[PDB]
Design a protein around this ligand. Structure first.
Ligand SMILES: NC(=[NH2+])c1ccc2[nH]c(-c3ccccc3O)nc2c1
Ligand code: NA
Lengths: 11, 250, 36
C-alpha cells in the first residue's frame, strides 16, 4: 500500500 | 480522523509521520518543534502489554507530507533518529499518564513551505487557551472509522471538554497530565482521532500573536467517535519542564 | 530548543506569512469568544 521510498533511508 | 476533511497543502507544516522500516508502515503521527526535535506519544514506541519497544533504527520520520502512501519526491524529507527519550514516569501499566517522548533527529531538516515547526506554549498561552469550549485541531493519516484509511492528511477541529465530563465518560483514572476533547452527543457535530493518529498534534491558534501552539499530543480514546466518549491528549504545558530539560541537556 | 521553540514557529509559509487563511481556522478563533 505504501509506495517505496529511496533505499538511502534504510541503509 | 473520523468526520474530518482533507487538509490543504501546507496547512500543518509541522505534521510528522513515524514510519517503520520493515514492514514499512505508518506507526503514528508526531510534530516538528525545532529543526532537530520531534515530539510524539511514548506509547507509540514503548507499550509492553503488546510487546512494543522500538529503537532509533526501527523508525524513520517523514516530514512535509500530504499523501499518506506516496513518496512525495522533492517535497518531503526523511530523517533518521539519533535518540529517543521517553518521560521517566510514563505510566503504561495503568492509564498512559505522561504519554510523551522526544526524538532527536540525526541531522537538522531545512524548512520549506511544507516543513515548519510549531510553537510550544508558555504558561500564559496555556492559561488563556486551554478553556472548555475552545476548539483545537488534530491532524493525522489514521483510520477514518473505528472499524477505511485516507489518501491525504485529514483535519478535524474539536472543542476542549470540562474535566468532570471527561472523568465521567470513562472508568480510567484521569490525571492532570491529560485533557479530553470532542463534541457531546448533544452537539450534532462529530469527530475524533482514531488508530494511527496517536502521537500527532492538537494545536490552537493564538489570537494575540497569530501563531499556532501545540497544546496536546493525541494519546488515547475508547473506540473512535463513539457517542459519550472523548479523545484524551497529553497536556504538553504540564510536561514542558521535562521537555526543556532534555532539550538543553542533550 | 530552549523553551518556547524556534522563534519563527507557528507561522505557516503558505498562510500566515502570505496573510492567507485556511478554510476552517476561522472556526477556532470564533470559539475563543471571537478573536479580533
Ligand atoms: N479515539 C481516539 N481519540 C484515539 C486516539 C489515538 C489512538 N491511538 C490508538 C491506537 C490503537 C492501537 C494501537 C495504537 C494506537 O495509538 N487508538 C486511538 C484512539
Ligand atoms: Na464522542
Amino acid at each position: 500500500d505504501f509506495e517505496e521510498i529511496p533505499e538511502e533511508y534504510l541503509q | 480522523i473520523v468526520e474530518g476533511s482533507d487538509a490543504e497543502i501546507g496547512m500543518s507544516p509541522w505534521q510528522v509521520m513515524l514510519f517503520r522500516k520493515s514492514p514499512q508502515e505508518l506507526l503514528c503521527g508526531a510534530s516538528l518543534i525545532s529543526d532537530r526535535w520531534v515530539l510524539t506519544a511514548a506509547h507509540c514506541l514503548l507499550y509492553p502489554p503488546w510487546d512494543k519497544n522500538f529503537t532509533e533504527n526501527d523508525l524513520l520520520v517523514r516530514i512535509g507530507k500530504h499523501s499518506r502512501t506516496r513518496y512525495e519526491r522533492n517535497i518531503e524529507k526523511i530523517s533518521m533518529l539519533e535518540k529517543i527519550y521517553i518521560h521517566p514516569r510514563y505510566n503504561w501499566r495503568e492509564n498512559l499518564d505522561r504519554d510523551i517522548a522526544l526524538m532527536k533527529l540525526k541531522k537538522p531538516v531545512a524548512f520549506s513551505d511544507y516543513i515548519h515547526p510549531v510553537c510550544l506554549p508558555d504558561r500564559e498561552t496555556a492559561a488563556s487557551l486551554l478553556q472548555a469550549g475552545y476548539k483545537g485541531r488534530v491532524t493525522g493519516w489514521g483510520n477514518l472509522k473505528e472499524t477505511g484509511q485516507p489518501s491525504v492528511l485529514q483535519v478535524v477541529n474539536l472543542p476542549i471538554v470540562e474535566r468532570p465530563v471527561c472523568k465521567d465518560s470513562t472508568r480510567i483514572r484521569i490525571t492532570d497530565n491529560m485533557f479530553c476533547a470532542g463534541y457531546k452527543p448533544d452537539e450534532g457535530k462529530r469527530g475524533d482521532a482514531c488508530e494511527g493518529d496517536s502521537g500527532g498534534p492538537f494545536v490552537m491558534k493564538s489570537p494575540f500573536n497569530n501563531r499556532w501552539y501545540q497544546m496536546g499530543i493525541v494519546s488515547w480514546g475508547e473506540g473512535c467517535d463513539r457517542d459519550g466518549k472523548y479523545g484524551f491528549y497529553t497536556h504538553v504545558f504540564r510536561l514542558k519542564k521535562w521537555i526543556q530539560k532534555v532539550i538543553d541537556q542533550f | 530548543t530552549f523553551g518556547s521553540g524556534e522563534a519563527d514557529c507557528g507561522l505557516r509559509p503558505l498562510f500566515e506569512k502570505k496573510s492567507l487563511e485556511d478554510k476552517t481556522e476561522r472556526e477556532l478563533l470564533e470559539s475563543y469568544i471571537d478573536g479580533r
